[PDB]
Amino acid sequence: QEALHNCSNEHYPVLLSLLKTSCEPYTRFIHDWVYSGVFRDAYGEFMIQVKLYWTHGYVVFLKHIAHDIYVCGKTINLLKL
Amino acid sequence: EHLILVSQLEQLHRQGLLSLQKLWFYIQPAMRTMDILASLATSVDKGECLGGSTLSLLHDRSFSYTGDSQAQELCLYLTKAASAPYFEVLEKWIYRGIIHDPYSEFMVEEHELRKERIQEDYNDKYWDQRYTIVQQQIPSFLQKMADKIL
C-alpha cells in the first residue's frame, strides 16, 4: 500500500527496490505449488495452506487469483498420484 | 562425501579467506541431507523396523519430498538399495518353488503342515497354514499383487 501511496516523489525508487525484494519469497511460493504441486511457507504467516480428496484445510495482494491458486495446487497434487 | 566437503572447507580456511557467513552459506545443502537422514534414522529406530516394515517407510518417504528433487534422488536410490535383497528373495519365490529365506523378514513364511497331513494333499494344506502370509512384512506397494505372488 505504501507503493501506491507515493509514486510521484523522489522516494519512489527506494520503496520500489524494497518491495521488489520483499515480494520475492511470496512469488517463490506461488511458483512451486502451481507447477509442482508442493507448497512452501516460512512460519505459517501466509494463511493459504492445504477418499474424496477435498477434505483439506485452508488456514494487498491480487485476490482475483489468490483463491484460484488454492484449487490450482490441489489438482496438481491429485494428478501427481 | 560429507568428509570430502569439509576437507574442501579445510583448504579454504587454510587459505585465509573463509568467513563464518560464507561457511554458513556452504553447509546448508548438506544440512538438508543430514536432516533427512536423521529423521529417517529416528523413525526406523523407534519402531524397531526391519524387513518390509522399513521398506514401506521408504516407499512413503520417497513419495513425501518431491518439491526440490535435491532429496528425491537420495530416497529413490535408498529405496532401491534397501529393496535389492528383497527383490532377489521375491524373484526366487516367483520362478522356483524353492526359497532359502535367510532372515525372517519376507512376506511369505513357510511352516510345515506336512507333519500334520503326511503323504497327502487331501487337506489342500498348501492353501492352508503351510505357506502363509505375514501382514506387516509387505512393503505396501506389492500389496495389490499379494495373492498372485503367493
Swiss-Prot record, chain A:
Subunit structure: Component of the gamma-tubulin ring complex (gTuRC) consisting of TUBGCP2, TUBGCP3, TUBGCP4, TUBGCP5 and TUBGCP6 and gamma-tubulin TUBG1 or TUBG2. TUBGCP2, TUBGCP3, TUBGCP4, TUBGCP5 and TUBGCP6 assemble in a 5:5:2:1:1 stoichiometry; each is associated with a gamma-tubulin, thereby arranging 14 gamma-tubulins in a helical manner. Gamma-tubulin at the first position is blocked by TUBGCP3 at the last position, allowing 13 protafilaments to grow into a microtubule.
Residues shown, of full length: 507 to 607 of 1819
Disease implicated: Microcephaly and chorioretinopathy, autosomal recessive, 1: A syndrome characterized by microcephaly, cognitive impairment, underdeveloped retina and choroid, and epilepsy in some patients. The more anterior parts of the retina, near the periphery and pars plana, have a grayish hue and diminutive vasculature similar to retinopathy of prematurity. Visual impairment becomes evident during the first year of life.
Stated name of the protein: Gamma-tubulin complex component 6
Described function: Component of the gamma-tubulin ring complex (gTuRC) which mediates microtubule nucleation. The gTuRC regulates the minus-end nucleation of alpha-beta tubulin heterodimers that grow into microtubule protafilaments, a critical step in centrosome duplication and spindle formation.
UniProt family annotation: Belongs to the TUBGCP family.
Compartments it resides in: Cytoplasm, Cytoskeleton, Microtubule organizing center, Centrosome
Organism (species): Homo sapiens
Swiss-Prot record, chain B:
Disulfide bridge map: none
Annotated consequence of substituting R32C: In CDCBM15; uncertain significance
Compartment(s): Cytoplasm, Cytoskeleton, Microtubule organizing center, Centrosome
Tissue expr: Ubiquitously expressed.
Subunit structure: Component of the gamma-tubulin ring complex (gTuRC) consisting of TUBGCP2, TUBGCP3, TUBGCP4, TUBGCP5 and TUBGCP6 and gamma-tubulin TUBG1 or TUBG2. TUBGCP2, TUBGCP3, TUBGCP4, TUBGCP5 and TUBGCP6 assemble in a 5:5:2:1:1 stoichiometry; each is associated with a gamma-tubulin, thereby arranging 14 gamma-tubulins in a helical manner. Gamma-tubulin at the first position is blocked by TUBGCP3 at the last position, allowing 13 protafilaments to grow into a microtubule.
Disease: Cortical dysplasia, complex, with other brain malformations 15: An autosomal recessive disorder characterized by global developmental delay, variably impaired intellectual development, speech delay, facial dysmorphism, microcephaly, and varying degrees of cortical malformations including pachygyria, thin corpus callosum and subcortical band heterotopia. Most patients have generalized seizures.
Protein family membership: Belongs to the TUBGCP family.
Functional description taken from the UniProt entry: Component of the gamma-tubulin ring complex (gTuRC) which mediates microtubule nucleation. The gTuRC regulates the minus-end nucleation of alpha-beta tubulin heterodimers that grow into microtubule protafilaments, a critical step in centrosome duplication and spindle formation. Plays a role in neuronal migration.
Name the record gives this protein: Gamma-tubulin complex component 2
Encoding gene, per UniProt annotation: TUBGCP2
